[PDB]
Amino acid sequence: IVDRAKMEDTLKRRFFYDQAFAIYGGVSGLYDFGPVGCALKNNIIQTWRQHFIQEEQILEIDCTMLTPEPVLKTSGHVDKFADFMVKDVKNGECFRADHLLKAHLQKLMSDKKCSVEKKSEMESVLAQLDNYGQQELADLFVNYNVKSPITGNDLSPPVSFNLMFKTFIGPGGNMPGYLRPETAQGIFLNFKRLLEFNQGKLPFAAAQIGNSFRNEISPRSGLIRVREFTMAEIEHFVDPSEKDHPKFQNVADLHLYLYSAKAQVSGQSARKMRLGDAVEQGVINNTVLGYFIGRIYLYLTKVGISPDKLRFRQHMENEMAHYACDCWDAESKTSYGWIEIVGCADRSCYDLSCHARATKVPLVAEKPYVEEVVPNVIEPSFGLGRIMYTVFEHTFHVREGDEQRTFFSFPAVVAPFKCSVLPLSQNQEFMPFVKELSEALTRHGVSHKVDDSSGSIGRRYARTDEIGVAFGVTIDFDTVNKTPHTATLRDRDSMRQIRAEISELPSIVQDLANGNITWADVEARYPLFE
Amino acid sequence: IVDRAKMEDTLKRRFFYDQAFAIYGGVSGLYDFGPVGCALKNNIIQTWRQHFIQEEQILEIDCTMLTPEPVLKTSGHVDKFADFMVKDVKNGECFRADHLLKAHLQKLMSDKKCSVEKKSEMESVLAQLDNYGQQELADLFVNYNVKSPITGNDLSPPVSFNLMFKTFIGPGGNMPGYLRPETAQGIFLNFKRLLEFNQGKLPFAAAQIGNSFRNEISPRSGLIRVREFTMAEIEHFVDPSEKDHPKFQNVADLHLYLYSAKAQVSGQSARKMRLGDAVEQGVINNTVLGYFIGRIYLYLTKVGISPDKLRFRQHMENEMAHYACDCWDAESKTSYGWIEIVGCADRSCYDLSCHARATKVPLVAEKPYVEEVVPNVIEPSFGLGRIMYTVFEHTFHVREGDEQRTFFSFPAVVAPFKCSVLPLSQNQEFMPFVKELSEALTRHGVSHKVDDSSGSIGRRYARTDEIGVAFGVTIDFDTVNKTPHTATLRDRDSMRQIRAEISELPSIVQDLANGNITWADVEARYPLFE
Numbered sequence A, B: 001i002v003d004r005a006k007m008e009d010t011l012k013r014r015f016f017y018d019q020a021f022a023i024y025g026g027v028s029g030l031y032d033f034g035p036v037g038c039a040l041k042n043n044i045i046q047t048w049r050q051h052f053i054q055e056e057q058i059l060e061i062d063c064t065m066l067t068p069e070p071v072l073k074t075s076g077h078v079d080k081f082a083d084f085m086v087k088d089v090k091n092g093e094c095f096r097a098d099h100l101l102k103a104h105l106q107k108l109m110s111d112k113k114c115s116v117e118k119k120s121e122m123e124s125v126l127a128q129l130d131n132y133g134q135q136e137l138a139d140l141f142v143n144y145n146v147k148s149p150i151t152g153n154d155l156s157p158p159v160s161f162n163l164m165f166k167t168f169i170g171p172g173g174n175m176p177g178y179l180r181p182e183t184a185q186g187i188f189l190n191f192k193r194l195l196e197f198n199q200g201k202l203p204f205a206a207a208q209i210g211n212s213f214r215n216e217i218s219p220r221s222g223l224i225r226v227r228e229f230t231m232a233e234i235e236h237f238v239d240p241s242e243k244d245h246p247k248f249q250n251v252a253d254l255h256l257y258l259y260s261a262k263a264q265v266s267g268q269s270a271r272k273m274r275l276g277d278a279v280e281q282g283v284i285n286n287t288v289l290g291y292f293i294g295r296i297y298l299y300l301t302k303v304g305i306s307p308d309k310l311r312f313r314q315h316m317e318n319e320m321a322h323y324a325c326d327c328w329d330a331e332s333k334t335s336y337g338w339i340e341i342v343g344c345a346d347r348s349c350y351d352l353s354c355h356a357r358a359t360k361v362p363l364v365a366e367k368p369y370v371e372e373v374v375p376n377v378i379e380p381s382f383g384l385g386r387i388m389y390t391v392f393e394h395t396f397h398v399r400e401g402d403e404q405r406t407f408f409s410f411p412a413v414v415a416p417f418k419c420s421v422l423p424l425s426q427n428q429e430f431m432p433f434v435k436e437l438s439e440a441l442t443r444h445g446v447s448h449k450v451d452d453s454s455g456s457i458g459r460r461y462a463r464t465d466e467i468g469v470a471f472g473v474t475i476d477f478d479t480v481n482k483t484p485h486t487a488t489l490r491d492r493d494s495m496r497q498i499r500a501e502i503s504e505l506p507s508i509v510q511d512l513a514n515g516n517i518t519w520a521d522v523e524a525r526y527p528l529f530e
């Protein structure tokens, strides 16, 4: 439970993100990220690079966004990459049928005049929404007589709407193209040279961190529904018969809420299992898929996602994408309900074959006299956009005080900047201290900034908390005059402080941010300062 | 002088970059960057972030690429952002008139039957190509009777061709849009909130590092002419009356080739002046423009550009962009002649006014009772693409040996990875040494990789040189058996080696890469090893 209104106001005001082309009315689904928003957005991409590319020695490539029609036709995007759209016969307003039907049903379940028996029937309908194909949706749109959410008019029947943007490469119109809806395709088209890097053996993973475009129908979910976002996709090619990851044990003891496809149809709830035990019962097919599922859990957590609001929902029989056979999604409980922030699929061979059969160019690998095989790819799809937004809601808190101050409990690895060095006076009396501390912090690799804003030391930290600065050191007169020279180390979340010698503080803030010492540990070693 | 053919072959083979959608024939102007290409491309963006954003405390924002028609119409891109295109009346092949006329004239100047008097007349025509407007070009295309470079047919008259990509945002066609040709526009549309960050005072600079799209007519310049590239633009807003940068002295003693607009019309050559002296004579208007010009020189140099092939050419009277009044470009002497890699303009007020007058929203600032002024922006435009490619040619060398081996003399700050630790055997005899050195290097922050490839130690380094790895440490038996345990430190460019104790090598390689010690210094302290 989070007050979205209050939050968005803080985010936009401190400029984390805001409506793109605002002075023109803005375009729904498009936002610009201000300074802090970038510092945070950057820290997350940096953490991801470490957690995956670096930790797994993933081959990184950077393909183009512009794509010639022929390429996406083969992958099957020109045909299946779409959403069902409806529009009131009156004017020409469009809506994503998929969601409008869900918005309506939720409206009925809320009305007090609704029977318990119907409430159920509907809950069953919503828990199977991503399965209802073309026809099935048309009927539900009749049975429930869904009508325009605005000036309730009559909606035309649900029709598919290709989400890919369209353009023309070069003068003339002989080469029509689209803006890549995903990045994965680029890695497949380069499978040859890529496989060559690993001596030709499997498994090997290729990755990409770039922009994808999705001409969303009716974006109304803040940063959740954008037509332009940055995503980090991993394409882990493995031998279909050797689907066993040599590191699965490093993430086997992790306990996370799994929501099988069965539990979704068998009407029961998600169970908090153990990955190791998960693979046993057969919930999670193999251990490769299992390994990444665990790593994904670790990443999201380390970046600011709350475990008590993070689950992995499996897909339904016919919910499968036009390129997958099995899949699991990392969903976060937000103010918009459960939403897919990271998508981990298991699109066995499909892709490579399509491009090979179309271009008349072989894309395979061999294994020991020797047999050629079609690699089975597990693609963890990260939406850095939704992932960041989740961190926003999960860490946005309101300080217990009439002034209604807010703050984000951002981990030290993602906060705009870890420490905030703020002195009382800027005269040449404090400089020798501010200068030292700063440079000292830098040597320890702790991002910081010397606060200049006006107001009381308490109002200073008030602005610091808003953008979620992890810590803060107060340098007052007793620090400059008294001796030993000690400063005040203030914790963001607790607001509780400490008084240690200003020379040792750097190493202290370092361990605190790096998770080598607990704030409790600090209060035990040094004298508390009210 | 560089053998482009040989180079491109090495780049593509080691996969620095290559044709996007290769297995489909590829699309001209589109390329994909392989692993090494990314490591290098990343290092350059990282260096730029330090050299500018970090060194100047620039406010970083990240706007959208999709832009609604109304926004670009105001900036004046829907009208002037184009190139003159011609096409042979036979089939429908298009060409950029601007360049075809230049290709033809160069053909004539080469023919031995050309008179000295005409050769001149033409040299004068080419040195004024970016000034010839619509009509002027049509005539030259008649006087010289230019015809299709292929199967020489007849070219239609030169007509403008808008370079901006076109699409449609959202279902329907009520909101037509383009893919931003530049990033600057985004910073202007956010001038309000941005100015607020600096307390409302000037000067203050905003920056952006993102992708821009330019539907180039006929791309045939490798990575020089792309329809999709990453650029880092800086928008330094300053008071029109206070055009004086407080750091100009830090870059005043720099000596760099300046090519005034006069020297371009007065038919003389570029002079290697001193920035300080440059501002005096009035060559470079103010010192703000001068400061960035110096910093730009430093950056390019630090990344791998050769001074003897780097100049700053000023624009011509009517060469000015549709948004500028004065400008200077950093051009690199490549195999394609002189090309603009970094563009530093001085588009005084223009922009902010246009958006304000169109949206009926004021975008100004005040100064001390108080007067509101229209900020004069100096926009340094970096094309990380062309900049990287220049580094390629300027540092690509061929080893003097029949085997025809190649290598790139990449600075330590941009090389894929600084050091290459390569042992002879991988047995548990060397591991205790490889492990230590590696971890030791990491502690010193030196990017490295343990070489595994097969072949002689000399053939191992042969592959290392190709991707331009700065150094390399050889760990042989005398390192494991003999004591003290010393390894071999090999320099890339010189191939000359050294023999120092394997424990001290880390700190040595660190200073070498960080420019704290010269390779000559090393050969003076430690025993040479043949």
Ligand SMILES: Nc1ncnc2c1ncn2[C@@H]1O[C@@H](COP(=O)(O)CP(=O)(O)OP(=O)(O)O)[C@H](O)[C@H]1O
Binding pocket: A214, A216, A223, A224, A225, A226, A227, A229, A231, A321, A340, A341, A342, A343, A381, A382, A383, A384, A385, A386, A387
């Ligand atoms: N419009 C959007 N805005 C932000 N991120 C998006 C996005 N569309 C996709 N993503 C990212 O990429 C997604 C990969 O899974 P996809 O199957 O492509 C989502 P989907 O099911 O096709 O659309 P939907 O979840 O809105 O129904 C990640 O879940 C999400 O972070």
Ligand SMILES: Nc1ncnc2c1ncn2[C@@H]1O[C@@H](COP(=O)(O)CP(=O)(O)OP(=O)(O)O)[C@H](O)[C@H]1O
Binding pocket: B214, B216, B223, B224, B225, B226, B227, B229, B231, B321, B340, B341, B342, B343, B381, B382, B383, B384, B385, B386, B387
């Ligand atoms: N097609 C392209 N490919 C690579 N970089 C490009 C590019 N177009 C522009 N840039 C980058 O952005 C440029 C900014 O100057 P611009 O005035 O926009 C070039 P221009 O004069 O408009 O086109 P031209 O130099 O090809 O005639 C930098 O010089 C260049 O690095």
